[PDB]
Ligand binder design. Structure first.
Ligand SMILES: CNC(=O)C[C@@H](Cc1ccc(OP(=O)(O)O)cc1)C(=O)N[C@@H](CCC(=O)O)C(=O)N[C@@H](CC(N)=O)C(N)=O
Ligand SMILES: [Cl-]
Ligand SMILES: [Cl-]
Ligand SMILES: [Mg+2]
Length: 100
C-alpha cells in the first residue's frame, strides 16, 4: 500500500546513485529538496544519466512540472506515467525495481 517512490530527504547525489542502478528508463523517485527546503524534486532515470525536475507550485498550492497541475504529488506522478516528464525525450514514469 505505501508508495515505492517517496524517499523523503535524500540528497540529489544519493538519488542519482540509486537510479543509476535501475535498468529501465522512467524509473523514478520523489525527494524533498535540500537546496530549497519545503520544495519537492523529481529524479528520473534515462540512459546512463539521471534527470532532475523541480516540482513547481501555483498560488493555491497545486503541483506541476510544466503546465498541467494537480491537488497532490500522487496525482502528478500518476499523470506523468502516461505523459512525458521531458520536453526533449519521451520519458514515462515507472515504479523502481525495489530491493526485496
Ligand atoms: C541539471 N539541471 C537541473 O538539475 C535543474 C532542473 C531543475 C531543478 C531540479 C532540482 C534543483 O535542485 P535540487 O532539488 O537540489 O536537485 C534545482 C533545479 C532542470 O532544469 N531540469 C530540466 C529537465 C531535466 C534535464 O533536462 O536535465 C528542466 O528543463 N526542468 C524544467 C521543468 C522542471 N519542472 O524542472 C525547469 N527547469 O523548469
Ligand atoms: Cl532494475
Ligand atoms: Cl514553486
Ligand atoms: Mg507525452
Amino acid at each position: 500500500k505505501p508508495h515505492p517512490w517517496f524517499f523523503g530527504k535524500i540528497p540529489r547525489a544519493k538519488a542519482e546513485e540509486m537510479l543509476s542502478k535501475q535498468r529501465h528508463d522512467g524509473a523514478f523517485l520523489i525527494r524533498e529538496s535540500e537546496s530549497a527546503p519545503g520544495d519537492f524534486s523529481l529524479s528520473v532515470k534515462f540512459g546512463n544519466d539521471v534527470q532532475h525536475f523541480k516540482v513547481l507550485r501555483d498560488g493555491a498550492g497545486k503541483y506541476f512540472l510544466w503546465v498541467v497541475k494537480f491537488n497532490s504529488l500522487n496525482e502528478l506522478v500518476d499523470y506523468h506515467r502516461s505523459t512525458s516528464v521531458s520536453r526533449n525525450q519521451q520519458i514515462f514514469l515507472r515504479d523502481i525495481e525495489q530491493v526485496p
